[PDB]
Short mmCIF file of all heavy atoms in Angstrom, two decimals:
data_model
loop_
_atom_site.label_atom_id
_atom_site.label_comp_id
_atom_site.label_asym_id
_atom_site.label_seq_id
_atom_site.Cartn_x
_atom_site.Cartn_y
_atom_site.Cartn_z
N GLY A 1 -2.90 -87.68 -41.29
CA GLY A 1 -4.24 -88.25 -41.26
C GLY A 1 -4.92 -88.15 -42.61
O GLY A 1 -4.24 -88.20 -43.64
N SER A 2 -6.24 -88.01 -42.63
CA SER A 2 -7.01 -87.95 -43.87
C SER A 2 -7.18 -86.48 -44.31
O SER A 2 -7.30 -85.60 -43.47
CB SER A 2 -8.41 -88.54 -43.69
OG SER A 2 -8.39 -89.85 -43.14
N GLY A 3 -7.22 -86.27 -45.61
CA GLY A 3 -7.51 -84.95 -46.13
C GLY A 3 -7.21 -84.81 -47.61
O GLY A 3 -7.08 -85.79 -48.31
N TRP A 4 -7.11 -83.55 -48.05
CA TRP A 4 -6.90 -83.19 -49.44
C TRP A 4 -5.78 -82.15 -49.54
O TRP A 4 -5.59 -81.37 -48.62
CB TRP A 4 -8.17 -82.56 -50.00
CG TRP A 4 -9.28 -83.56 -50.15
CD1 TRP A 4 -10.02 -84.10 -49.16
CD2 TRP A 4 -9.75 -84.13 -51.38
NE1 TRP A 4 -10.93 -84.98 -49.68
CE2 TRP A 4 -10.79 -85.02 -51.04
CE3 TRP A 4 -9.40 -83.96 -52.72
CZ2 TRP A 4 -11.48 -85.75 -51.99
CZ3 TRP A 4 -10.10 -84.69 -53.67
CH2 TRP A 4 -11.13 -85.56 -53.31
N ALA A 5 -5.09 -82.15 -50.68
CA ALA A 5 -4.19 -81.06 -51.06
C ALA A 5 -4.82 -80.29 -52.20
O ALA A 5 -5.38 -80.87 -53.12
CB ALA A 5 -2.84 -81.62 -51.47
N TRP A 6 -4.71 -78.96 -52.17
CA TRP A 6 -5.39 -78.11 -53.15
C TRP A 6 -4.50 -77.07 -53.80
O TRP A 6 -3.59 -76.52 -53.16
CB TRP A 6 -6.54 -77.36 -52.51
CG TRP A 6 -7.49 -78.21 -51.70
CD1 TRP A 6 -7.45 -78.44 -50.36
CD2 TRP A 6 -8.65 -78.89 -52.20
NE1 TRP A 6 -8.51 -79.24 -49.99
CE2 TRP A 6 -9.25 -79.53 -51.10
CE3 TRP A 6 -9.23 -79.02 -53.46
CZ2 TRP A 6 -10.42 -80.31 -51.22
CZ3 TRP A 6 -10.38 -79.79 -53.59
CH2 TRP A 6 -10.96 -80.43 -52.48
N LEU A 7 -4.75 -76.82 -55.08
CA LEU A 7 -4.37 -75.55 -55.69
C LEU A 7 -5.63 -74.70 -55.67
O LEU A 7 -6.65 -75.10 -56.23
CB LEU A 7 -3.93 -75.77 -57.15
CG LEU A 7 -3.61 -74.49 -57.94
CD1 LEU A 7 -2.40 -73.81 -57.34
CD2 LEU A 7 -3.42 -74.76 -59.42
N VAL A 8 -5.59 -73.56 -54.98
CA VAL A 8 -6.75 -72.67 -54.91
C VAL A 8 -6.43 -71.29 -55.47
O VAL A 8 -5.27 -70.90 -55.57
CB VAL A 8 -7.25 -72.46 -53.47
CG1 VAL A 8 -7.68 -73.77 -52.86
CG2 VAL A 8 -6.17 -71.79 -52.63
N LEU A 9 -7.49 -70.56 -55.84
CA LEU A 9 -7.32 -69.16 -56.24
C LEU A 9 -7.86 -68.29 -55.12
O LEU A 9 -9.04 -68.36 -54.79
CB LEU A 9 -8.08 -68.89 -57.54
CG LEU A 9 -8.04 -67.45 -58.08
CD1 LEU A 9 -6.61 -66.99 -58.33
CD2 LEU A 9 -8.88 -67.32 -59.34
N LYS A 10 -6.98 -67.51 -54.50
CA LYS A 10 -7.40 -66.58 -53.45
C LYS A 10 -7.27 -65.15 -53.98
O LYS A 10 -6.19 -64.59 -54.04
CB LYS A 10 -6.54 -66.76 -52.19
CG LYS A 10 -6.48 -68.20 -51.69
CD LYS A 10 -5.42 -68.43 -50.62
CE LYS A 10 -5.81 -67.82 -49.28
NZ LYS A 10 -4.90 -68.26 -48.20
N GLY A 11 -8.40 -64.56 -54.37
CA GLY A 11 -8.35 -63.27 -55.04
C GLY A 11 -7.88 -63.49 -56.47
O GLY A 11 -8.52 -64.21 -57.23
N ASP A 12 -6.77 -62.87 -56.84
CA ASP A 12 -6.16 -63.17 -58.13
C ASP A 12 -4.79 -63.84 -57.96
O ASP A 12 -3.93 -63.74 -58.84
CB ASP A 12 -6.06 -61.92 -59.00
CG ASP A 12 -5.65 -60.67 -58.23
OD1 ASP A 12 -4.70 -60.76 -57.42
OD2 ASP A 12 -6.28 -59.62 -58.43
N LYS A 13 -4.60 -64.52 -56.85
CA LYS A 13 -3.31 -65.18 -56.54
C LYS A 13 -3.52 -66.66 -56.20
O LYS A 13 -4.21 -66.98 -55.24
CB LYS A 13 -2.62 -64.44 -55.40
CG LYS A 13 -1.30 -65.06 -54.93
CD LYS A 13 -0.56 -64.14 -53.94
CE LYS A 13 0.58 -64.86 -53.23
NZ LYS A 13 1.51 -63.93 -52.54
N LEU A 14 -2.92 -67.54 -56.99
CA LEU A 14 -2.97 -68.97 -56.75
C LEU A 14 -2.14 -69.36 -55.53
O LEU A 14 -1.09 -68.77 -55.27
CB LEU A 14 -2.45 -69.73 -57.98
CG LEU A 14 -3.32 -69.73 -59.24
CD1 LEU A 14 -2.60 -70.38 -60.39
CD2 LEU A 14 -4.66 -70.41 -58.96
N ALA A 15 -2.62 -70.36 -54.78
CA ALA A 15 -1.89 -70.86 -53.62
C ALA A 15 -2.10 -72.35 -53.38
O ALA A 15 -3.05 -72.94 -53.88
CB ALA A 15 -2.28 -70.08 -52.36
N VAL A 16 -1.19 -72.96 -52.64
CA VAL A 16 -1.35 -74.35 -52.26
C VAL A 16 -1.75 -74.45 -50.81
O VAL A 16 -1.16 -73.80 -49.94
CB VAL A 16 -0.06 -75.15 -52.57
CG1 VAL A 16 -0.03 -76.45 -51.77
CG2 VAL A 16 0.03 -75.41 -54.06
N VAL A 17 -2.78 -75.24 -50.54
CA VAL A 17 -3.27 -75.45 -49.18
C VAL A 17 -3.72 -76.88 -49.04
O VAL A 17 -3.85 -77.59 -50.03
CB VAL A 17 -4.45 -74.52 -48.84
CG1 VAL A 17 -4.00 -73.06 -48.77
CG2 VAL A 17 -5.59 -74.69 -49.86
N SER A 18 -3.92 -77.32 -47.81
CA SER A 18 -4.55 -78.61 -47.58
C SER A 18 -5.63 -78.50 -46.51
O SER A 18 -5.65 -77.56 -45.71
CB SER A 18 -3.51 -79.67 -47.18
OG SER A 18 -3.14 -79.53 -45.82
N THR A 19 -6.54 -79.47 -46.50
CA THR A 19 -7.61 -79.55 -45.53
C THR A 19 -7.67 -80.95 -44.94
O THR A 19 -7.20 -81.90 -45.58
CB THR A 19 -8.96 -79.27 -46.19
OG1 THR A 19 -9.10 -80.12 -47.32
CG2 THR A 19 -9.03 -77.80 -46.65
N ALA A 20 -8.26 -81.06 -43.76
CA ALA A 20 -8.48 -82.34 -43.08
C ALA A 20 -9.77 -83.00 -43.55
O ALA A 20 -10.75 -82.31 -43.87
CB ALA A 20 -8.57 -82.12 -41.57
N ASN A 21 -9.78 -84.33 -43.57
CA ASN A 21 -11.00 -85.11 -43.78
C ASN A 21 -11.69 -84.73 -45.06
O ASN A 21 -11.03 -84.69 -46.10
CB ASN A 21 -11.88 -85.01 -42.53
CG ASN A 21 -11.12 -85.39 -41.28
OD1 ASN A 21 -10.35 -86.36 -41.31
ND2 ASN A 21 -11.29 -84.64 -40.19
N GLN A 22 -13.00 -84.41 -45.05
CA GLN A 22 -13.63 -83.98 -46.28
C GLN A 22 -13.87 -82.46 -46.29
O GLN A 22 -14.72 -81.95 -47.02
CB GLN A 22 -14.96 -84.73 -46.54
CG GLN A 22 -14.81 -86.23 -46.82
CD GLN A 22 -13.91 -86.52 -48.01
OE1 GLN A 22 -13.63 -85.66 -48.85
NE2 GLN A 22 -13.42 -87.77 -48.07
N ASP A 23 -13.11 -81.73 -45.47
CA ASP A 23 -13.20 -80.27 -45.50
C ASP A 23 -12.77 -79.73 -46.85
O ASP A 23 -11.99 -80.36 -47.56
CB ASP A 23 -12.35 -79.65 -44.39
CG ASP A 23 -12.89 -79.90 -43.01
OD1 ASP A 23 -13.91 -80.60 -42.87
OD2 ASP A 23 -12.27 -79.40 -42.03
N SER A 24 -13.29 -78.55 -47.21
CA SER A 24 -12.93 -77.92 -48.47
C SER A 24 -12.57 -76.44 -48.22
O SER A 24 -13.11 -75.82 -47.30
CB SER A 24 -14.08 -78.02 -49.47
OG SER A 24 -13.95 -77.05 -50.51
N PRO A 25 -11.64 -75.90 -49.02
CA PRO A 25 -11.32 -74.47 -48.90
C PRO A 25 -12.58 -73.61 -49.09
O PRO A 25 -12.61 -72.49 -48.60
CB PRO A 25 -10.35 -74.24 -50.05
CG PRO A 25 -9.78 -75.58 -50.35
CD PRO A 25 -10.88 -76.55 -50.10
N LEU A 26 -13.60 -74.14 -49.76
CA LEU A 26 -14.85 -73.39 -49.96
C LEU A 26 -15.53 -73.12 -48.62
O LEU A 26 -16.27 -72.16 -48.48
CB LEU A 26 -15.82 -74.13 -50.89
CG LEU A 26 -15.33 -74.22 -52.33
CD1 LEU A 26 -16.18 -75.20 -53.12
CD2 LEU A 26 -15.29 -72.83 -53.01
N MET A 27 -15.26 -73.96 -47.62
CA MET A 27 -15.87 -73.78 -46.30
C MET A 27 -15.29 -72.60 -45.53
O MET A 27 -15.86 -72.19 -44.52
CB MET A 27 -15.72 -75.04 -45.46
CG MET A 27 -16.23 -76.28 -46.13
SD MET A 27 -15.96 -77.72 -45.12
CE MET A 27 -16.88 -78.94 -46.10
N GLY A 28 -14.17 -72.07 -46.00
CA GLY A 28 -13.53 -70.95 -45.32
C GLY A 28 -12.53 -71.41 -44.26
O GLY A 28 -12.50 -72.56 -43.88
N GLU A 29 -11.71 -70.46 -43.79
CA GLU A 29 -10.65 -70.77 -42.83
C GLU A 29 -11.14 -71.09 -41.42
O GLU A 29 -10.52 -71.89 -40.70
CB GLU A 29 -9.61 -69.66 -42.77
CG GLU A 29 -8.76 -69.54 -44.02
CD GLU A 29 -7.56 -68.63 -43.83
OE1 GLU A 29 -7.45 -68.01 -42.75
OE2 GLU A 29 -6.74 -68.53 -44.76
N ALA A 30 -12.23 -70.45 -40.99
CA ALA A 30 -12.78 -70.71 -39.67
C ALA A 30 -13.10 -72.20 -39.51
O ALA A 30 -12.85 -72.79 -38.45
CB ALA A 30 -14.03 -69.88 -39.44
N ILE A 31 -13.63 -72.80 -40.55
CA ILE A 31 -14.03 -74.19 -40.49
C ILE A 31 -12.89 -75.12 -40.90
O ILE A 31 -12.55 -76.06 -40.18
CB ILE A 31 -15.30 -74.45 -41.37
CG1 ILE A 31 -16.49 -73.71 -40.76
CG2 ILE A 31 -15.59 -75.94 -41.48
CD1 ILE A 31 -17.71 -73.63 -41.67
N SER A 32 -12.29 -74.84 -42.06
CA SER A 32 -11.36 -75.80 -42.66
C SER A 32 -9.90 -75.44 -42.47
O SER A 32 -9.04 -76.27 -42.75
CB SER A 32 -11.61 -75.90 -44.16
OG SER A 32 -11.01 -74.82 -44.84
N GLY A 33 -9.60 -74.23 -42.03
CA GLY A 33 -8.22 -73.81 -41.88
C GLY A 33 -7.63 -73.32 -43.19
O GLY A 33 -6.48 -72.88 -43.25
N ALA A 34 -8.43 -73.39 -44.26
CA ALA A 34 -8.01 -72.89 -45.56
C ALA A 34 -9.15 -72.13 -46.21
O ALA A 34 -10.30 -72.28 -45.80
CB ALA A 34 -7.58 -74.04 -46.45
N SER A 35 -8.82 -71.32 -47.20
CA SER A 35 -9.82 -70.58 -47.95
C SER A 35 -9.39 -70.53 -49.41
O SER A 35 -8.25 -70.91 -49.74
CB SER A 35 -9.94 -69.16 -47.39
OG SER A 35 -8.75 -68.44 -47.65
N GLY A 36 -10.27 -70.06 -50.28
CA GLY A 36 -9.96 -69.97 -51.69
C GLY A 36 -10.80 -70.89 -52.54
O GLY A 36 -11.38 -71.86 -52.05
N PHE A 37 -10.86 -70.58 -53.83
CA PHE A 37 -11.63 -71.33 -54.81
C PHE A 37 -10.76 -72.44 -55.42
O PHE A 37 -9.75 -72.14 -56.05
CB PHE A 37 -12.14 -70.38 -55.90
CG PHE A 37 -12.75 -71.06 -57.07
CD1 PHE A 37 -14.01 -71.63 -57.00
CD2 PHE A 37 -12.07 -71.11 -58.28
CE1 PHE A 37 -14.56 -72.26 -58.10
CE2 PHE A 37 -12.61 -71.73 -59.39
CZ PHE A 37 -13.87 -72.30 -59.29
N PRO A 38 -11.13 -73.71 -55.22
CA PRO A 38 -10.30 -74.83 -55.72
C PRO A 38 -10.18 -74.87 -57.24
O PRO A 38 -11.17 -74.91 -57.94
CB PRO A 38 -11.05 -76.08 -55.22
CG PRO A 38 -11.93 -75.60 -54.12
CD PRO A 38 -12.32 -74.19 -54.51
N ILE A 39 -8.94 -74.90 -57.73
CA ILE A 39 -8.69 -75.09 -59.15
C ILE A 39 -8.52 -76.60 -59.47
O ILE A 39 -9.06 -77.12 -60.44
CB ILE A 39 -7.45 -74.31 -59.60
CG1 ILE A 39 -7.66 -72.81 -59.37
CG2 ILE A 39 -7.10 -74.62 -61.06
CD1 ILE A 39 -8.85 -72.22 -60.12
N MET A 40 -7.80 -77.28 -58.59
CA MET A 40 -7.60 -78.74 -58.73
C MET A 40 -7.25 -79.25 -57.33
O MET A 40 -6.94 -78.47 -56.44
CB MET A 40 -6.54 -79.03 -59.78
CG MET A 40 -5.54 -80.15 -59.46
SD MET A 40 -4.28 -79.67 -58.28
CE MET A 40 -2.81 -79.62 -59.31
N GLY A 41 -7.33 -80.56 -57.11
CA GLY A 41 -7.09 -81.10 -55.79
C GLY A 41 -6.70 -82.55 -55.80
O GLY A 41 -6.99 -83.28 -56.77
#
């Protein structure tokens, strides 16, 4: 479906995650299923 792929920083460890629609890792896992500070997307 629709969404984004992200490189995020979780703590001091980079990770790859994705979100649905216009969700963002900034919204947290409860809402978006992902967490972390986006480096690029």
Side-chain angles (χ1 to χ4, degrees):
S2 308
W4 290 74
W6 309 94
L7 176 65
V8 299
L9 178 59
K10 307 168 73 169
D12 42 45
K13 176 171 168 166
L14 289 174
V16 160
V17 292
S18 78
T19 52
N21 306 319
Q22 293 303 341
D23 290 2
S24 161
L26 293 168
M27 306 178 173
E29 290 192 356
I31 293 168
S32 80
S35 68
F37 170 75
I39 299 300
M40 139 284 250

